[PDB]
Design a protein around this ligand. Structure first.
Ligand code: SF4
Ligand code: SF4
Ligand SMILES: [Fe+3]
Ligand SMILES: [Fe+3]
Lengths: 491, 491
């Protein structure tokens, strides 16, 4: 028998002479209250010879957990928990943890605006308590808890969108100049619209121009944010062009939320962090006091005007609903054949080129709704429109997933069909915990047949992957052409 | 030279080159393009060191770090040496540390909320911390040290709020002599920390005539005037949490788990155990929001318990009972008839290295008093230690969350003898097992208590750098040998 927890082999050939086990005693001729000499688990946590359990190299660590003192050798539980928890349950606990992390991020951003939800904080406590050492061992309960986390994330994104709309108005379409103007510059990266508003308020009259980057692009749609003239436009693209963007523009850089990367020496003395963002050797902004960043921007050599391009962002729900009747006409005529939700968080992985290919081969009688940084794979494509309806529609940040939700609910009422009968396909890009919370949000809405890229989450063992694919029909991204062919044929 | 990826250990060999990217066989590493990245995890030339120290030894459980929360993760399985995102092992371990501290805080928050007691600033800090440990938000280790200390302070605040909840709902605890041993009649044994579930159970059992016994962590309930007022609160039964498997087997009782430390059941008592609150076990009935009718029904269906020659324990020393003896303690210390106080307690484990505690207390000189708490008390609370001059040599402050009164106690002592906190005749010996204990430890560290002892082991997430921080900046001393430790602590 080899120990499930620490892979200690009890071999009936040796026995244990020091304890009374003369050499030759079978495993089942051991005392009843005998425990493991390494991990202190009973006779049950001994399995008849499995085979080279750990010995992991290219992958296959069965599980990981070192949160309690019982952990094997004081380093990590990696096959089975000393507490008795198996690998699948540990991975489900980590899944719930990531979802609640995404919820907590959106919660922090809402509270930045004075918007609070008590039941969500209670659920945070409840979930983190559920992932303690010896509290919960039920996997199905963790499925239930993941779905409840999806529901709470719906609620949290709803609260954050209400915070944004009350503080800045409902976003409406805006053509954003991507390209520099003449003058000192501050580039802002992240999600915090409150930090951007404070900076814009502090820079009115200073004459330094403020540009958005990555997930701060949707700010150009908010009436309370676009009203500032020194909000010049976009500059750079998604988060991972950061190191080149911040290098090439001679500007002060401020990172407001996550997706900030370790800086390169070219712009290290001209970068700042604020909110929760924090980098070693980078100056951090005390609350919202952006005096150092403005100082830097005015000390730096100004930017140079450049032939600019444009991006179109900020489709609030109301702008889309003012087009519902034409969309109805167009689908019933047949001049629009399907809606595709293609977006979410991105990564510099090669498999994410899939997205640029996917939209590039999409038929021209289709429309795309995009989201988060994964929009920067195809938002510059000149796709045009269908009888006045744009083929690309930018709802905003990842937290604007919620309006996407609202949209389908309208569409189900528009065409008088159940949600899982619409001419709608869903293609997710995920990268972080916020995306995990969004994914479980979509799963709590029973959205079947969704596609996911660039990879399946690293915390999902075979058990979890199969539960998703057989109970929720979550389809991994494969080949763009074949995927489109599968999604569009009711024939 | 050959070159090793720090992130995924892909070896670039100048004899082969890299056929997949364009590097013909024979190219030296420094004659590679600037934009050449690892063909496995796509991290640049920057994170490549010359294959120095090709030595590799035991890899199981000797994983430098672990993290698989994002899609960038190595091989889509786990980052185990350095993050593709750029996060180092020390920072990952500090993030996990903060996560465990906030997990303990969340547990105490849930228990406080059970009583209608909530604190907004603590939930704000929870959100803030989880956001600090998202993917690309914080890479500054010093800031995570600061956040661990802030988590200690927030945990102090949470424990204070929880103690106020307990005292408002049940009164201030006072010493109680509780019978450990069964009575005649049907029985329900309750395990965990939730006093509200116990109160609801006792109210629902008034008149039913079934006797309720406390186990592991519900023992301090016998000190609360609002809980000891119920006659059917018979006494203690069993000991700490880890005797569960035998205790629940030997007594023909219905089992109810109110909080954490519930273990996978054995078939003898599975059909007679119930969970409630956050505790949940597979194949065990869960109680839906109190309403303990199923548990009472079960207790009434089982063969009743039989009386047994019992022992006794003394628990529940509230702050007021202790402070009403402060002048006697002053007399005794100033005369010299008490030479040092020892705080010995905290959550315990079925680890063998924890036998130290029973030895440590058993060898303590008779001119010392011990203050204990949590499950680590069950190592020496049955010892007949007696008293010194009317002051008991063992004092049970209550649950692990009653650590806070210990905090208050020491400040009283510093004001009692008019001496600085870090000059009192007081030594601290911690037992830890879980995340609640981690929060308590960071609470103690935010209070600058130097020279504390910790057992049974050093946290499994503390790499050499973190351990170095603890031992050089806060003089955290691991427990060694009882006599040697006592002689050092008594000098
Ligand atoms: S909680 Fe369980 S799996 Fe995690 S370290 Fe402790 S014994 Fe191991
Ligand atoms: S955040 Fe970094 S360490 Fe964690 S999974 Fe992503 S790449 Fe790996
Ligand atoms: Fe073992
Ligand atoms: Fe690599």
């Amino acid at each position: 028998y080899r120990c499930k927890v620490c892979d200690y082999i009890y071999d009936p050939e040796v026995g244990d002479p020091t304890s009374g086990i003369k050499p030759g005693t079978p495993f089942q001729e051991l005392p009843e209250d005998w425990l493991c000499p390494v991990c202190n688990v009973g006779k049950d946590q001994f399995e008849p010879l499995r085979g080279e359990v750990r010995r992991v190299r290219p992958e296959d660590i069965d599980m990981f957990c070192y949160q309690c003192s019982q952990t094997v050798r004081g380093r990590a539980c990696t096959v089975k928990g000393v507490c008795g928890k198996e690998a699948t349950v540990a991975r489900l606990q980590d899944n719930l943890l990531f979802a609640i992390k995404g919820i907590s991020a959106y919660l922090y951003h809402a509270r930045e605006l004075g918007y609070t939800d008590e039941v969500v904080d209670a659920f945070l406590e409840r979930g983190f308590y559920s992932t303690l050492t010896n509290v919960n061992f039920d996997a199905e309960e963790f499925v239930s808890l993941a779905l409840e986390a999806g529901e709470m994330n719906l609620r949290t994104m709803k609260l954050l969108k209400k915070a944004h709309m009350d503080t800045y108005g409902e976003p409406e379409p805006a053509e954003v100049r991507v390209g520099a103007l003449d003058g000192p510059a501050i580039i802002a990266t992240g999600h915090s619209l409150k930090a951007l508003e404070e900076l814009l308020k502090q820079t009115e009259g200073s004459g330094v121009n403020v540009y958005t980057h990555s997930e701060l692009l949707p700010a150009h749609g908010y009436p309370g944010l676009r009203k500032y003239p020194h909000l010049a436009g976009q500059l750079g693209g998604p988060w991972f062009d950061q190191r080149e963007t911040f290098s090439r523009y001679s500007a002060a850089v401020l990172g407001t939320s996550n997706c900030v990367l370790l800086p390169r020496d070219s712009y290290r003395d001209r970068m700042f962090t604020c909110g929760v963002a924090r980098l070693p050797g980078v100056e951090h902004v005390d609350g919202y006091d952006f005096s150092p960043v403005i100082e830097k921007a005015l000390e730096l050599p100004p930017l140079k005007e450049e032939d600019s391009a444009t991006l179109t962002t900020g489709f609030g729900l109301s702008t889309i609903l003012s087009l519902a009747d034409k969309i109805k006409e167009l689908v019933e005529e047949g001049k629009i054949r399907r809606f595709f939700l293609v977006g979410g968080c991105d990564s510099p992985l090669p498999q994410a080129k899939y997205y640029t290919e996917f939209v590039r081969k999409l038929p021209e009688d289709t429309v795309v709704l995009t989201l988060a940084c994964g929009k920067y794979r195809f938002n510059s494509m000149d796709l045009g429109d269908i009888d006045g309806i744009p083929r690309l529609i930018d709802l905003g940040q990842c937290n604007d997933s919620i309006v996407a939700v609202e949209l389908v609910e309208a569409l189900s009422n528009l065409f008088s069909m159940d949600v899982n009968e619409l001419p709608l396909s869903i293609v997710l890009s995920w990268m972080e915990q916020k995306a995990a919370a969004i994914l479980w949000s979509l799963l709590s809405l029973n959205l079947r047949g969704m596609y996911i890229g660039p990879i399946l989450p690293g915390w999902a063992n075979d058990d979890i992957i199969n539960v998703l694919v057989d109970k929720y029909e979550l389809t991994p991204i494969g080949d763009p052409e074949e995927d489109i062919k599968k999604m569009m044929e009711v024939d």
